[PDB]
Nucleic acid binder design. Structure first.
Ligand SMILES: [Mn+2]
Ligand SMILES: [Mn+2]
Ligand SMILES: [Mn+2]
Ligand SMILES: [Mn+2]
Ligand code: NA
Length: 347
DNA sequence: CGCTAGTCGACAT
DNA sequence: CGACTAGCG
């Protein structure tokens, strides 16, 4: 996420209802509904007991969107991203820790805290996601497993005109360059839409409302790919970019002390890390549903050389990418767990 | 005022 | 994979 981004650009938001997008296509960051639905049956999942509450939970939202005349395209997280593997190790070990801690707190008699500790152990498997996938295919709803992060895939689907809005709880989508993002949507359709064009309404941003500058700001504040410098948040980063009349961000990051009046030392790790983060936001591998090909989020600029972008996602053969995207190929074992075919029945 | 970092809701009975 | 809020620059 970009910590505190929503309240920072709150002036560009607008309370709406999804009825607004009737007769149009909307992509969904399904992990949110998956997580929320998985909260309801934390004990069943932790113990390993069979359950399918989260499926119906997601299907409520899906059927709702279908009822209001929307065509939803559920998008799911795929393979792990190397840039994001630190946090994905942290969350893992913490999940295990709270799992065992809850298992022990079950024996104290404090069942009230064992379940709260089971809440911090929710691990959304790809099998659950695939249950949701078949459940969605039942009502003739298209699904798409991102080659890596769902964020990038959604961003592409939005910037390519395939969808007109994105349903998520994550503010990362704005940093990826989404035109329209619908946050905090309930089971009835009440949501909070953030439009990119309205970023100019935010006084705090100043002239930092262009996609590139906005990206730089979000990265400088601290993201999932690169932790920020101690004492650097959204406001100070935005201040840096505002006071900086320089197309070359590197020298600016170097003169961050001159811009912020703070004696800040910039390590050599942070420059490379910044270029890493920017290249991750720009050229993370997504999946084209039309041409059925593995492509970066944005077209490669002459500035960067793709050979040094393994962290932004590794390429594979397009057929395998297709079988992953359909959910037919297991993300982990790479073995065929299903055989759905859109040919013999978005693409 | 701005930022870090820890707490605790989210679902829902 | 988030919204607050105290505690500190
Ligand atoms: Mn995030
Ligand atoms: Mn995501
Ligand atoms: Mn994200
Ligand atoms: Mn400027
Ligand atoms: Na920060």
């Amino acid at each position: 996420g970009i910590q505190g981004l929503l309240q920072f650009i709150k002036e560009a938001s607008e309370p709406i209802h999804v009825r607004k997008y009737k007769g149009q296509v909307v992509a969904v960051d399904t992990y949110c509904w998956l997580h929320k639905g998985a909260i309801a049956c934390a004990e069943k999942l932790a113990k390993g007991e069979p359950t399918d509450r989260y499926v119906g939970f997601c299907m409520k939202f899906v059927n709702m969107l279908l009822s209001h005349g929307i065509k939803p395209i559920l998008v799911f997280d795929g393979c792990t991203l190397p840039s994001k593997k630190e946090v994905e190790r942290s969350r893992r070990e913490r999940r295990q820790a709270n799992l065992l801690k809850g298992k022990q707190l079950l024996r104290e008699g404090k069942v009230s805290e064992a379940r709260e500790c089971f809440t911090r152990s929710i691990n959304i498997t790809h099998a659950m996601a695939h249950k949701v996938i078949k459940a969605a295919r039942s009502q003739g709803v298209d699904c798409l497993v991102a080659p890596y992060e769902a964020d990038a895939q959604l961003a592409y689907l939005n910037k390519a005109g395939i969808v007109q809005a994105i349903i998520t709880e994550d503010s990362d989508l704005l940093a990826f360059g989404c035109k329209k993002v619908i946050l905090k949507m309930d089971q009835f359709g009440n949501g909070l839409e953030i439009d990119q064009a309205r970023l100019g309404m935010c006084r705090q941003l100043g002239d930092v409302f262009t996609e590139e500058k906005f990206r730089y700001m979000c990265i400088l504040s601290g993201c999932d790919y690169l932790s920020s410098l101690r004492g650097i948040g959204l406001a100070k980063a935005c201040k840096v970019l505002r006071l900086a009349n320089n197309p070359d961000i590197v020298k600016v990051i170097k003169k961050i002390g001159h811009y912020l009046k703070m004696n800040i030392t910039v390590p050599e790790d942070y420059i490379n890390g910044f270029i890493r983060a920017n290249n991750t936001f720009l050229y993370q591998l997504v999946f084209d549903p039309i041409k059925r090909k593995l492509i970066p989020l944005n077209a490669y600029e002459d500035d960067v050389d793709p050979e040094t972008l393994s962290y932004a996602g590794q390429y594979v053969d397009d057929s395998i990418a297709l079988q992953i995207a359909l959910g037919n190929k297991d993300i982990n074992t790479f073995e065929q767990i299903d055989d759905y075919n859109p040919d013999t029945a978005l693409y």
